[PDB]
């Protein structure tokens, strides 16, 4: 299979595969079974704002999501990705919907990676998406260009989401996210979302991921997969 | 299409050169549309500065070594009116009958377009055996000493002629928007060109090319890896 | 006293001054007589933005001032700053009434310099604290309002007052240009929000450089934008 | 009196003050006894590099000290800088010597500061000038000499003097924590050169964080680092 750490956004409780009673944001390490979570509080229909960092020195993953004038929820992780990830990989955000079903709009996100062995840097930053953004690989039914916007999942014209949906969008560069003889390496993602359902039921969440380079929507990775996982071992 | 900046160290005056080493600026064609005389230094470690922007609508270049004056060359023109929208940024070098290495020690890069912003900044000081966010094509290689070597360089550390190589970014780049407010780039790499008894040829551009740019069939010596002839 | 470079956005036509017969931007090299303008479509009431830039290659100072979803307008004059302003300078945002008044309300404010010979400043406000230390409010302007820098005197009501003078400029002392440099660059970036009761706003704002010490010069309300001592 | 964070790189063991019995590395809040150290390789005459992390989520200040092919040190303290420093600070490097003596020479610092409640800051000096006016100097510190940054007294011939204590602090003060910030993070880094006639070299170079009106504190030379008033 693919290799894949994400920080995932997750709008649906599967309990049967792990996951808490409530809408939460954990850190997965080559599983959706989350190594750590913590409670979120999803306001439907606003603009949250999604941080994550890690550093060679700390070895600890960590993700702040928030809304304005709202307590922000927090999870951390100590890993060592020299011991989970190839050195060479790409970057990218996920989404998916089941039977029950969200907006997964993406309004921005950037990304920011060092390497110091001679500082090696690499930076992008989209506030906007552009009909035909030739720096990103679109997988599943995640387009770009309806308000500037990147939809992760299929929205229907009238603006109403689709359910059993996937879809992801990956940075085209790889990324050199870490190195034997590296003094320091860090990195640094930042996103912008917009999680809107018609119903109580929102379904089933946004990640943030890191893949080897060829990275593919594994067969059948709808709903609680995230578009990330092949199965839920 | 090719823009380049030309750092020129043979004077092909057949196809337009100045009889000295000089910066140029190359607009769909290796005739410079404007150059400036260049005091190229064999072995010393060099530095060039590529700059634009969508208000002065002006590309501009400086080329510089330590305890020198520093040679610059500016023209003004429209790039919405001659890239695609949509390109790869890259280094191309090239010799002829005459040699020189053309090593790339660092080289990084910065694009931004405001909207009525979006980023992208590369930054490398060091080059790895498998640098998989550079696309080599011809005789380039990356690994020997940390460097980029865009020419081919035998065992006993000697450049070889008739030698083709570039170095491109592997994520296009979004060069120009027609409802951007200010769109901005920069470029900087460092250079070492050493001959083995002087007359070094033939040079090394910084470029910007369609995204799908290859080494055009003969394009070695005076063509600089950029062009198919001399037109 | 002071040597001042400034990008002006005058809102207030002075004709008596050399001013143009409309709100337009200008760029004042040691004087507030613009060595260059252009026709501004100023939006009484929207928030716009201004980008300054220059380097020691094309010595060319530029400015572009927008709003969203209407053309830009932009000036540009040939200058070598090398031949005008020292080498450390201090740099700020500058707003002033007269007669006439208007808000200079400041939403944001980033400034970058780089001077290779590299050495580099940079910051960034995209809002200001009610003791903001690392600025120095000249005059009547003060921070801290929903996080603004209000440049010229607002009564509670958030009203404009007249005969108001007020600056900013960043606490660090700016490299700007280098004898033995070989690039020189700099960038701003601002966004303000200018509101009128009537028709008549004034005077307007202006991103300035001067001399590390520079203070309001007396008697500068109003034409003169807080920057110079008279209309020469 | 001054609140202090620093990381100190300490050259000389002074075991009577709490110190390990080998050139190390240490945290220090509000105190001259590390609350965390780490042996440290120094090696003579070699240009060494430091970078320092903190950010409000980990609430962790980090630090790795290295030379070209040489395994790193590492030291790191979870602590909350809320309940240490006031929300406005100056940055430094501060450097001495006792009766034993080394160069404290700094050839490069950066520093970059981001609150999102973004506001930044970011310096970078690869150069030091005669006469550079975004840096408070202290004590025996000199700038101008090979554009050097020299934190230590060193005579014309070349060799460093003892009993000596030098500070150079960012003359801009930093917006360090804000209550309302969902993250705030600073990065420091700065390379340096440790040279010594002796194979007793002292006393150590130190990245700190203080209130903005911090000095050099009374008999702060030799283990103290120019840091601190007493060695509790
Ligand atoms: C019946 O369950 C389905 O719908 C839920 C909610 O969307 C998903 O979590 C799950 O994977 C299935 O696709
Ligand atoms: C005789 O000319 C040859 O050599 C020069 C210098 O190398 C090149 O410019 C040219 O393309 C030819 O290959
Ligand atoms: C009558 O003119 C006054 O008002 C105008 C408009 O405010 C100012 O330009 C001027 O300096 C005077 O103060
Ligand atoms: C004998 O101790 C003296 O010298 C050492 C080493 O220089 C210092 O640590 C100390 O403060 C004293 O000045
Ligand atoms: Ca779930
Ligand atoms: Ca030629
Ligand atoms: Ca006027
Ligand atoms: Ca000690
Ligand atoms: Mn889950
Ligand atoms: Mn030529
Ligand atoms: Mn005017
Ligand atoms: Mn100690």
Known sequence: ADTIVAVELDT???????DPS???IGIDIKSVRSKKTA???????????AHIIYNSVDK????????????????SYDVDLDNVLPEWVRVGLS???????????????????????????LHFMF????????????????????????????????????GSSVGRAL????????????????????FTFLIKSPDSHPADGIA???????????????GRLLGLFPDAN
Do not use: C
């Open 12 to 18: 649906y409780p599967n309990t049967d595969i792990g």
């Open 22 to 24: 409530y809408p939460h």
């Open 39 to 49: 409670k979120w509080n999803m306001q439907n229909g606003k603009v949250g704002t």
């Open 60 to 75: 600890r993953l960590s993700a702040v999501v928030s809304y304005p004038n709202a307590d922000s929820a927090t999870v």
């Open 95 to 121: 989404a998916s919907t089941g039977l029950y079903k969200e907006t997964n709009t993406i309004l921005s996100w950037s990304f920011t990676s060092k390497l110091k062995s001679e500082t090696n840097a």
């Open 127 to 162: 506030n906007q998406f552009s009909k035909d953004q030739k720096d990103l690989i679109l997988q599943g039914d995640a387009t770009t260009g309806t308000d500037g916007n990147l939809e992760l999942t299929r929205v229907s014209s009238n603006g109403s989401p689709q």
């Open 171 to 190: 940075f085209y560069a790889p990324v050199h996210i870490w190195e034997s003889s590296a003094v320091v390496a860090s990195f640094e993602a930042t």
């Open 208 to 222: 943030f991921f890191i893949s080897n380079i060829d990275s593919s929507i594994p067969s059948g990775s709808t």
